[PDB]
Amino acid sequence: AKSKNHTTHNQSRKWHRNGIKKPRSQRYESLKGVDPKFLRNMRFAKKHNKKGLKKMQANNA
Amino acid sequence: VNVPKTRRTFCKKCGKHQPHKVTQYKKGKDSLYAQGKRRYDRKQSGYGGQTKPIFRKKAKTTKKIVLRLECVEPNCRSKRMLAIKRCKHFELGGDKKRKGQVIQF
């Protein structure tokens, strides 16, 4: 006939068995979702980044 | 609702805002040679009776109102469909309401 409707009993110890693991961040996260006008400048700031190795290497040395 | 029967909106054929003629969309008549109708009439032929489901519920009381929009630029006179929200009483080019006068005895 009727039955139990809802409970979160036992749930807090279910998901502590394999731990509640934090999201493992890494260096160099993804650029998915940044401003599109911002992002095509940065692709242009790296497309022309070789334009000036010779001035840069004759300035570290 | 009360939409006016002229409107400046975007015309995709020319890529500008152009004057349009707002007209209400009507469902055309069925083809009798379309592919789902030809499948349907082949499936109903013979013995077996009714083969596809017949709906007969009609929970809705309104329909979405679709406006066909035709641009009045004369050399390309393309048409666009435009849907607005559900409404019971739809008029088109009706009287503009105004806040001054007395209504009504």
Binding site: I20, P23, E29, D35 | -
Partner: protein, 159 residues
Amino acid sequence: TNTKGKRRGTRYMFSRPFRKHGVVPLATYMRIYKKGDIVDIKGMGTVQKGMPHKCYHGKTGRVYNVTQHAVGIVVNKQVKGKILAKRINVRIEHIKHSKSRDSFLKRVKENDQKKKEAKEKGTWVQLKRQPAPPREAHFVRTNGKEPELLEPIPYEFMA
């Protein structure tokens, strides 16, 4: 069963403080949010565009994106079994810089100030703050007085 409405139960959360209604003070609009700084997400009620959902009110995340009026924050959210990082877009009325980081930036600027000046005095100065040691031995003067005797008061009944 409750509704799954977007502002269910935010009667007091998204309201305003007492006698702090009205025009937003204008210096919440001229903060500067660089990418990668820690912001506290709160959420006003005076501004309805761009408010975060109620599960983020009082969380804290870092900035990954900056627009004209808003920001992109990476916030941890503990849904039932796992914490997953959420990317939310919030207009900058609803956030503020977190001062939880700035005490740590106060002492990183204090430690580099004292490592290139540590050696020439022979100083090995303490950098690791230690968790509140027990009290050391000391003396307590009576100054001729004697300590006041305390004794419990008798009971009496009013209310």
